C-alpha cells in the first residue's frame, strides 16, 4: 500500500555499514576504564549522562532508512546482550561492527555469504568452548569484590558494598538498588519479615520516640478475610487478655465495629493490641499470609480449604513472635516461634515453584518470599548530588550487580579483552570444509582482537602494539589500561564474568553474520 | 469520479515490464543453494531478513502506477503459488517474468496475443503431463529427509528433524512449528491426550517436584455442563471412594459449592481427586468432550441428546485412565481404557467429516482430534540467538515441511531445475494449429530453461553453458550448484516435489499469458 | 453558487470530440476475434484484465471537463446497451463515436442539427426495419452453440457448455454463473427442490459417508410458524411411527422442547426423523413453503387464511417424497408425490405474477420458483488459475449467456458486422424531406460500415478493402477475421443476435445525434 525503495548490491551494504559504523562509533567511546560518557537529550526534562552501551544504542535513530536498518540491527545486538547477561553491551556492539565490516569486504561474485555465516558460527562455537575450558569458578569474596569493582568502572567502594551485601544476604539473595537522598552510598538490610503496611489507626502507639508500636513476645492472629463483626474479634482478645500478651492482628482490613472495639479497649483498659493490613492484592496476599503463618506458627482464618472460623480461635492457633515493630508505613516481625521443619518444607516448596515456568512477575515474588523466610533483603541507596549523577551511578551499580551474579553463576576469565585474545590459537586447529568457511573463520579470528584494541585506544595508546605484546606474552599476562602497563590480571583483579563474554560474542556474531548475507534492501519512501 | 490516465501500445507494456523486472530481480537473488537474503524494513520494529520469494514479493510496492500494475500481477503469481503448494515462489516469479518478457517481444501488428496465450497454455499442459509422467513416488524415509534438506537451503539438521518427526507421528500427522528460547532446534512429541487446561485450585498437588498432580489408574468424570450443586458431585465421589481410585473431573467449570467440597475432602480426608476445565469454547468443546469420553470409555453428563444427570452416575459410566498428569497450565491423559472398536469408529467418523467441505477453521480441528486420538502431535521449537534469526530459520523450516508434505502427496522429480529441462523434448512433438500457437509454444520452450539458469547464475557461473551441458548429458545427470559439478541428482538427493514444480509453472504461465494480451492500461492520476 | 466556464461554437465541440475519441479508442481495441484486452488499475487490490466494452468505458474519467462530458455521454451509450441487451457494447461505442464525428463535421452556419438528428433517427428506423426483415429464428441447438461460441470470443468449450445447459434445463431456464476453484469449467444441474438450509442438530445423520441424511418415501410436515410445544409435534411423530415412515419437518425453526424430543426419540428409539429450517426471510418464505407443499402434496400449518393447527395433523395432510437428502448446508427433495394438475396450476399462477410489473428483486424469485417446480437450475463454475483469469472468463461467459438468451428471444443475423452492411441499400430508397435530413441519412449510411471496418482493422488488415469486397460479394458471403478469408457466415457459424445489433445501433444513434446538436457547453471551473 506504501511505495517502496529497493536497493541492490554494494550500495545498500555501504549505507547499512554507515549506519552500523555511526552507532558503534557513538557506543565505543564508553568502553574500558578510560571510556567517556554520552549525553542524551530527553524530551521532557534534564538530559541523561550515561556510560552504558545499550542506553546509548537505544537512543540513536537515523533519518536515512538504510542507515536506520543497520542501526536497528546493532540495537538488537546490544539489547539482546543486555537482556541475557545484563552487562557487556559495548563489547557486543564493537564485535558486531567488526564482524559486519569484515564480512562486507569479503562479498564477491563467487563468494557464498551463507557458507561464510556457517563458518563464522562454527568458529564462534569453538571460541565459546575454549572460553568455557579456560574459566575458573568464584570461591572467595575477594573475587566477588574484584568483579564488582571492575564492572563499576573501577569504583572500590561500590565493589566493597556489593561484596558486603552478598556476604550478609547470601550470594543468591535479593539485592535491590534505589536512589538515595544522601551524598554517599548506603547499604541497609531488612531481616525477619517486613511488609509495607502500617497500623490502621494511630492509637496503638506506645513508644512515641519514633511514633512506633513495639511488642515483645506477642501473639499473632492472621485472617484471610476482613474482621468486622464483634464475635469474630472478641475471643482472640479474650485469649490475649487471659494470657496477658500483646496481640497483632494481620488481616485484609478491620471494619468499623471491630476497629472501634480495639481502639476503645486500648484506650480505656490499656490492653496491648495492634491491627495491620495484609500485604498483597491477589493470590500473593494469600501466599504471604500463609508464609507468615508458617514463620510465626499458627493458622490462617478464612481459607477456602480450611475455613477456620474466627469464633473457634484457640491459644495454640495464634502465632508467637519474639518481637513486632509497627510503624505508620510498615510492619516488621522478628523471631517467629514456629517449627523449623515446616519452615524448611515451605522453603523447598517455594524453590520448587521457582522452577516450573516464568511469567515476568512471579519468580521475583518467589525470590522475595524466600528472602523474607530465610536471610532478608539488601537495599543499596545510591547517593549523589543531583538526579543525573544518581542515575549514572545507578546504572554503574546495576551493571556491577549483574556482573557479580553472572560471575557467581558461571565463573570468571581474564579481563581487558584478553579472554578472547587467548582463544585465537583455538581457531588455528579448525579445518574449514570449503573456502567460505575459511573466510568466516578468518573473520572471527580478526574480530577476536577488537575488545582489547578498543580498550587500548580509549586509553590514548596504540591498540595494535598493545594487542601484539599481549599475544607475545605468557598466558597470565595482560594489559592494565588504567595503570597503563602489562600486569597479571588475576593478581590485579581485572577479571570478567565468562557468561558476559560468551553472551556478547554469541549475540554479536549471530546478528552480524545474518546481516552480512544480504543482497537487496527494501525500505519505505519517506512520505513524512 | 476520479480522473484517469490511459496509455496505449508499447509504452504501457514497457512500464509494466519495468515493474515486473524490478520485482523479479529483487526476488531472484534468493534462488538456489547460493542465493542471498533480502532485508525488508518493518514500520514498527526490527527489520526482517528473508530468503522467501513470496515474502520479498509482497513487500514491494512502486510509486508508478504502471510499474505497480506489473508488480501486483507478479505478486499474484507468487501468492497463488505459496497458497497452493507452500513452496516454489521464486521459481514461479522467475517463470512469470520470463513469460511476460518473451511475450512482449512477440506482439506485432499481425500477431494475436489471445492465440499466443492459447498456445502457451497448450504447451504448459503438455509439460505438466510430461512432469507427471516422469515423477516417482516417495517410499523411504531417506527420500523424506533429502526433500526436507533441499527445501531448507541444504540444512541437514532440519531435514533430519523433520524426517524423525514424520517417522514418529506418521507421514500425515500434525507437525507444528514455533519459536524456541534455546539456541538449537528441538523436537517434542505430545502423545495420548493433552489439552491446555490446568487444575482450578492448586490444592490437589500431591507430587510437588514440578508442582504437578499424578494419578495412576484413575476414574474420569466428563460433564458437558458446569458442576455446582452438592448433589451433582457427591455420588461420583462416593463411587470413587468406595472403589478407592483417584478421580479426575473434566467439566466447563466447577462452581463454589462443589469446588469447596472437593478441596475440603482432599485436604482433610486425603481423598485423591482433581478438577480440570473443558478444552474448547463452542461446538469444539462438545466434540473434544465426546472424543475424551470415547478414548477413556464412559459417558458425557449434560448432553442435549442423552441428558445423563450426574445424580445417576454409575461405576461403569466413569472412564478409566492408566495415568493422568495435571499441571498448572495443561492436563494430560495416557492409556485410556476404552474399547478399540469405538475408537476406530470415531476416527472413521472424523476422517469422514474431514471430506465434506472447508471453513478455514474446521479441518485443522479435525486433524488435531485425529492426532490426539491416534498418534499424537509433533512440535518443532526453532532455536536462534535473536528474533530475526528465528524468523528466518522458521521460514526455512515451514518451507521444508510444506515441501515434504507435497512430496508425500504427489512424488518427486529431479532438482536444480532439471525437471523442467527434461520436458523440452515433449514440446517438439506438438503441432501448433497456427503461427500464434507456435509462438506461444516457443515462448514456453524458452522459458523452461529459466530456473536452472537462475540457479547457476546465483552460483557465480555462466548459466547458459551449465544448461547446455545438462541438456547434452544423460537423463539422470544434472548440476550441483552447491558442490559446483555435474552429478546424479537422485543419488545426491537433489530432488523436488513434483506438485511444487507443476504448481509454480501453471500459476506463472496463467498469469503472465493474460498479462501479455494487453493493449491499453488505465490507471488513476496520482492526486496524492 | 459555483463559478462556471462557458464555451461556444467549434472549440467546445472539438474538446468533446477529443473526449469521445479517447474513450472510444480505448474501447475499440477489444473488438472482434483478434481484439486485445485492457488492464484497469483497482484501488483496493489486483488490477482487472477485461475485454468488455462497458467495463472499459465505465472506468475512464478525464480531468478536463469538456472531454469528460464527451466521455460521460459515450459511457451512457455503452451502459444503456449493456443494460438492455447484455452484449454489443463495443459496437455501440464505435457507432456512437462515428456518428458524433460525422455530425460534427456537418455543422455549418446554415445547417440545422435538429433536422439532421431527425434524419438520423429516420435512417436508423429504416435500418432497424431492414434488420428485422432479414433475421431468422433459432431452431437447432447447433445454432445456440454457435451463438454462444461467437459471443465468448470463439471459445468452443463455453459454447458447448451453454448449449448443454440450455438443452438440459430448457431454453428459458435458470442458468447462474459463479467462480470455480478448479482449473476447468464445470456444469452442475440442481433438480427437484433444493434450498440452502441444512439440519439443525447433527444428530439425525444416518449415512456418515458424507455426513448426510437420506430418507426414502418420506413424510413431509411443513409449518409456517415455529414448532416449540410438545403438543405441536407429538401427533405428527405418532402418525409417522404408526405408518413406519421417516418424517422431514420443515419450519422456520424448532425450539428447545420439540428439538429435544426429536433428538431424544432419534437417539433412543431410532425413529427416522429430520428437522430443517424454512428457506426465505419474508413473503418469499411463505411462497416457497406453499410451493413445496404443492409439489409434495399436503398442507401448510400456520397460514393466516387456513390456520391449520398442528394438533389436528392427519395422515393425508402430510406430503410424500420419493427421496429426501439433508446435508449440513442444504436440503433436497426429489419425487414429490403430489397431484400434477395442482402443480401445473401453481406454475401458471407464477407465470401470471411474472407479467404484472417489476421490482428489481421479484421476477428473479418467480423464475427461481418455476425452475424449482419444473426443470431445475444450471450452475456454471468457471475455472481458472488466479482471480483475474476467472473474472475475465466470467465476463466472457456472462456475455455468451446474454447473447444466447437474446438469440432465443429474437433470432439471428450475419455476424462480423455484415448485418449492418447489408442494410446500406435500404437507405438508398429513402427520400429526405430537406437537405438536413439527407445529411443525417448520409451520416447513418457512412456509420453502417464502422463495425466491420473496426473488426478488420483489429485483425491487422485494411478495413476499407475488406468492407468493399464484402459489399461487392453475394448476400450470404462475409469475412472471417479469425481465419482471415471470405466465407459463408451462416455455414461457418458467425452469427449475431439481431436484438443486440438493433439495440446497439438505436442507443448509439440516439445519444450521438443529441450530442451533435450542441452549440454551447457549460462546465464548472476546477476549484479542486
Ligand atoms: N583496569 C582495567 N584495565 C584493562 N581493562 C579493563 C580495566 N577495567 C575494565 N577493563 C575491561 O573493560 C571492559 C568493560 O568495559 P565496559 O565499558 O563495561 O564495556 P561493556 O559494557 O561491554 O562491559 C571489560 O571487558 C574489562 O575487561
Ligand atoms: N545443491 C543444489 N544444487 C542444485 N540445485 C539446487 C540445490 N539445492 C536446491 N536446488 C534447487 O533450488 C531450488 C530451490 O530454490 P528456492 O530458493 O527454494 O526457490 P523456490 O522458493 O522457488 O523453491 C529448487 O528447485 C532446487 O531444485
Ligand atoms: N470469427 C469471426 N470473424 C468475423 N467476425 C467475428 C468473428 N467472431 C466474432 N465476430 C464479430 O465480432 C463482434 C464481437 O465483438 P465484441 O468484442 O463482442 O464487441 P461487442 O461487445 O460490441 O459485441 C460480433 O459482432 C461478431 O459479429
Ligand atoms: F556498557 Be555495559 F552495560 F557495561
Ligand atoms: F522461496 Be520458496 F518459499 F522456497
Ligand atoms: F463488449 Be461486449 F460486452 F461483448
Ligand atoms: K560502556
Ligand atoms: K527463495
Ligand atoms: K469487446
Ligand atoms: Mg560493564
Ligand atoms: Mg523452497
Ligand atoms: Mg460480445
Amino acid at each position: 500500500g506504501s511505495a517502496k525503495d529497493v536497493k541492490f548490491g554494494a550500495d545498500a551494504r555501504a549505507l547499512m555499514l554507515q549506519g552500523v559504523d555511526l552507532l558503534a562509533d557513538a557506543v565505543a567511546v564508553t568502553m574500558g576504564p578510560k571510556g567517556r560518557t554520552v549525553i542524551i537529550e530527553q524530551s521532557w526534562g534534564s538530559p541523561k549522562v550515561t556510560k552504558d552501551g545499550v542506553t546509548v544504542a537505544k537512543s540513536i535513530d537515523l533519518k536515512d532508512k538504510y542507515k536506520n536498518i543497520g542501526a536497528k540491527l546493532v540495537q538488537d545486538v546490544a539489547n539482546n546482550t543486555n537482556e541475557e547477561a545484563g552487562d557487556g553491551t559495548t563489547t557486543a556492539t564493537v564485535l558486531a561492527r567488526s564482524i559486519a565490516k569484515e564480512g562486507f569486504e569479503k562479498i564477491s561474485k563467487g563468494a557464498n555469504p551463507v557458507e561464510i555465516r556457517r563458518g563464522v558460527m562454527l568458529a564462534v562455537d569453538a571460541v565459546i568452548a575454549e572460553l568455557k575450558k579456560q574459566s575458573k569458578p568464584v570461591t572467595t569474596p575477594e573475587e566477588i569484590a574484584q568483579v564488582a569493582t571492575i564492572s563499576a568502572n573501577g569504583d572500590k567502594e561500590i565493589g566493597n558494598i556489593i561484596s558486603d551485601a552478598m556476604k550478609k544476604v547470601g550470594r543468591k539473595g535479593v539485592i535491590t538498588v534505589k536512589d538515595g537522598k544522601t551524598l554517599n552510598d548506603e547499604l541497609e538490610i531488612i531481616e525477619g519479615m517486613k511488609f509495607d503496611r502500617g497500623y490502621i489507626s494511630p492509637y496503638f502507639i506506645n513508644t512515641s520516640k519514633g511514633q512506633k508500636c513495639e511488642f515483645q513476645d506477642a501473639y499473632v492472629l492472621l485472617s484471610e478475610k476482613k474482621i468486622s463483626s464483634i464475635q469474630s474479634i472478641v475471643p482472640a482478645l479474650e485469649i490475649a487478655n487471659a494470657h496477658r500478651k500483646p496481640l497483632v492482628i494481620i488481616a485484609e482490613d478491620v471494619d468499623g465495629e471491630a476497629l472501634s472495639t480495639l481502639v476503645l479497649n486500648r484506650l480505656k483498659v490499656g490492653l496491648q493490641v495492634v491491627a495491620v493490613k495484609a500485604p498483597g492484592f491477589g493470590d500473593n496476599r494469600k501466599n504471604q499470609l500463609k508464609d507468615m503463618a508458617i514463620a510465626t506458627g499458627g493458622a490462617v482464618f478464612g481459607e477456602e480449604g480450611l475455613t477456620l472460623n474466627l469464633e473457634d480461635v484457640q491459644p495454640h492457633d495464634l502465632g508467637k513472635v519474639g518481637e513486632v515493630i509497627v510503624t505508620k508505613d510498615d510492619a516488621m516481625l522478628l523471631k517467629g516461634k514456629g517449627d523449623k521443619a515446616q519452615i524448611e518444607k515451605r522453603i523447598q516448596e517455594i524453590i520448587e515453584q521457582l522452577d516450573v515456568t516464568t511469567s515476568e512477575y512471579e519468580k521475583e515474588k518467589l525470590n522475595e518470599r524466600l528472602a523474607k523466610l530465610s536471610d532478608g533483603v539488601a537495599v543499596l541507596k545510591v547517593g549523589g548530588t543531583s538526579d543525573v549523577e544518581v542515575n549514572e551511578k545507578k546504572d554503574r551499580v546495576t551493571d556491577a550487580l549483574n556482573a557479580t551474579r553472572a560471575a557467581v553463576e558461571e565463573g570468571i576469565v581474564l579481563g581487558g579483552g584478553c579472554a578472547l585474545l587467548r582463544c585465537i590459537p583455538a581457531l588455528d586447529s579448525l579445518t574449514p570444509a570449503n573456502e567460505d568457511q575459511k573466510i568466516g573463520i578468518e573473520i572471527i579470528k580478526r574480530t577476536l582482537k577488537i575488545p582489547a584494541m578498543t580498550i587500548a585506544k580509549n586509553a590514548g595508546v596504540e591498540g595494535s602494539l598493545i594487542v601484539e605484546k599481549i599475544m607475545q606474552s605468557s598466558s597470565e599476562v595482560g594489559y592494565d589500561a588504567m595503570a597503563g602497563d602489562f600486569v597479571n590480571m588475576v593478581e590485579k583483579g581485572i577479571i570478567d564474568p565468562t557468561k558476559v563474554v560468551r553472551t556478547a560474542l554469541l549475540d554479536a556474531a549471530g546478528v552480524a553474520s545474518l546481516l552480512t548475507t544480504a543482497e537487496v534492501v527494501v525500505t519505505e519512501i519517506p512520505k513524512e
Side-chain angles (χ1 to χ4, degrees), chain A:
Chain A
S2 56
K4 298 281 169 66
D5 190 31
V6 193
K7 265 199 171 50
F8 297 80
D11 305 323
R13 284 182 224 122
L15 283 146
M16 286 192 314
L17 192 57
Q18 280 184 52
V20 168
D21 259 301
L22 174 57
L23 199 135
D25 275 341
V27 168
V29 310
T30 86
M31 163 98 103
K34 301 215 173 181
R36 300 170 182 188
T37 74
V38 176
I39 304 190
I40 304 156
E41 151 193 334
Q42 309 276 72
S43 64
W44 53 96
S46 188
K48 263 192 56 56
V49 179
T50 176
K51 210 182 153 285
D52 208 60
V54 72
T55 307
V56 179
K58 284 178 321 213
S59 69
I60 286 191
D61 298 84
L62 305 189
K63 196 90 228 302
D64 200 352
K65 305 283 201 159
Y66 314 93
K67 305 195 189 171
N68 203 32
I69 282 186
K72 276 276 182 294
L73 287 179
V74 189
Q75 278 184 26
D76 284 350
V77 177
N79 197 55
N80 288 320
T81 310
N82 187 57
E83 296 311 313
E84 206 287 9
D87 203 28
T89 54
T90 308
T91 304
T93 299
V94 300
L95 287 171
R97 168 181 61 172
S98 178
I99 295 165
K101 196 192 79 70
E102 255 54 57
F104 276 166
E105 309 164 2
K106 302 278 110 173
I107 306 303
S108 294
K109 211 238 280 193
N112 196 7
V114 175
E115 276 293 326
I116 293 174
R117 169 175 163 81
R118 287 177 210 182
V120 160
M121 288 323 259
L122 187 127
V124 166
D125 281 350
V127 170
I128 278 161
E130 183 71 33
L131 264 171
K132 282 183 176 166
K133 204 174 304 175
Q134 86 179 19
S135 88
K136 67 168 189 184
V138 163
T139 47
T140 59
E142 280 81 37
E143 289 173 356
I144 284 306
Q146 284 170 347
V147 168
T149 309
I150 283 297
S151 321
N153 202 12
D155 200 349
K156 297 275 179 182
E157 281 333 288
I158 291 177
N160 286 328
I161 286 295
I162 293 189
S163 163
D164 286 332
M166 279 195 165
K167 279 184 284 187
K168 289 187 248 191
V169 315
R171 277 176 183 178
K172 299 200 179 57
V174 170
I175 306 177
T176 325
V177 174
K178 48 163 37 65
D179 86 303
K181 294 184 295 206
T182 168
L183 196 72
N184 316 262
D185 288 24
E186 294 166 331
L187 160 65
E188 99 163 284
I189 296 167
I190 277 80
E191 286 294 329
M193 287 231 177
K194 158 161 158 173
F195 39 96
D196 47 273
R197 299 291 168 93
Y199 44 73
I200 291 101
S201 80
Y203 274 115
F204 320 110
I205 306 174
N206 59 317
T207 292
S208 190
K209 178 179 170 49
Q211 300 311 120
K212 40 202 210 171
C213 174
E214 286 62 356
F215 290 138
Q216 263 79 264
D217 299 329
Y219 275 138
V220 184
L221 165 77
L222 306 121
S223 176
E224 167 72 303
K225 293 175 175 60
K226 320 198 182 180
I227 289 134
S228 59
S229 78
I230 294 296
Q231 315 69 19
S232 49
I233 190 60
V234 152
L237 297 183
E238 288 264 323
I239 296 153
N241 206 359
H243 283 330
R244 298 233 74 261
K245 285 166 65 172
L247 171 77
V248 192
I249 301 151
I250 295 171
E252 295 196 11
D253 202 359
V254 178
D255 294 329
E257 284 253 308
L259 197 281
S260 312
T261 321
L262 291 174
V263 201
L264 155 72
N265 272 274
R266 158 84 182 92
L267 263 60
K268 278 49 189 203
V269 169
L271 184 72
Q272 290 148 311
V273 86
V274 67
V276 177
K277 295 180 65 69
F281 270 132
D283 205 341
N284 215 276
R285 214 201 290 241
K286 330 150 91 153
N287 294 124
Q288 314 221 44
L289 217 30
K290 163 40 55 73
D291 270 87
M292 281 160 324
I294 290 175
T296 61
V300 181
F301 297 88
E303 298 210 288
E304 307 296 338
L306 259 295
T307 326
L308 281 200
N309 39 86
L310 283 151
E311 287 82 6
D312 205 339
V313 71
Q314 297 298 114
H316 77 98
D317 280 316
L318 295 184
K320 286 135 307 271
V321 283
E323 145 185 35
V324 48
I325 294 175
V326 188
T327 278
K328 155 174 226 63
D329 179 19
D330 42 12
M332 161 175 348
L333 296 153
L334 308 320
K335 286 114 74 203
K337 261 66 188 176
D339 62 327
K340 307 268 202 302
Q342 228 180 345
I343 298 171
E344 318 331 304
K345 219 213 73 153
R346 186 60 174 191
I347 276 172
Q348 294 304 315
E349 281 205 38
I350 291 141
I351 73 107
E352 289 281 33
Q353 329 185 340
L354 252 182
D355 272 295
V356 285
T357 184
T358 173
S359 171
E360 287 88 22
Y361 207 83
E362 51 94 20
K363 65 272 191 181
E364 165 259 7
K365 292 303 179 174
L366 303 158
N367 285 309
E368 188 77 35
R369 294 214 269 125
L370 282 142
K372 292 194 180 189
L373 262 177
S374 52
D375 253 25
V377 305
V379 175
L380 316 172
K381 288 182 288 300
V382 182
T385 293
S386 46
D387 271 333
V388 48
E389 320 197 7
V390 175
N391 294 343
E392 205 262 327
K393 198 178 190 181
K394 214 184 298 184
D395 298 20
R396 270 191 280 133
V397 169
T398 312
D399 272 349
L401 268 182
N402 289 326
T404 323
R405 272 195 255 275
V408 156
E409 295 158 23
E410 299 223 357
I412 47 170
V413 282
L414 296 182
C418 312
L420 288 184
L421 272 186
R422 301 312 175 173
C423 296
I424 289 181
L427 293 174
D428 303 348
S429 64
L430 294 185
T431 302
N434 42 69
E435 179 63 39
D436 307 304
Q437 306 226 359
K438 182 158 66 234
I439 291 178
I441 294 170
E442 294 322 298
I443 284 174
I444 285 306
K445 189 173 315 175
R446 280 193 295 263
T447 308
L448 279 188
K449 306 183 183 64
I450 290 302
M453 248 168 240
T454 319
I455 291 166
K457 176 196 167 167
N458 281 350
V461 311
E462 184 68 47
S464 307
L465 301 183
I466 295 300
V467 166
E468 200 50 57
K469 196 160 178 302
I470 286 165
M471 284 184 328
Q472 294 310 316
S473 309
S474 58
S475 179
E476 80 275 334
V477 158
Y479 181 66
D480 193 318
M482 203 33 195
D485 50 6
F486 288 81
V487 297
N488 199 311
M489 326 279 300
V490 182
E491 171 181 299
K492 300 293 178 162
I494 314 170
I495 42 187
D496 269 15
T498 165
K499 175 179 179 183
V500 168
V501 189
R502 68 163 177 82
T503 289
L505 177 71
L506 190 43
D507 285 274
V511 182
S513 320
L514 190 59
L515 158 69
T516 55
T517 56
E519 179 72 26
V520 179
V521 177
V522 187
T523 57
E524 264 175 275
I525 281 179
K527 54 176 79 66
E528 300 295 326

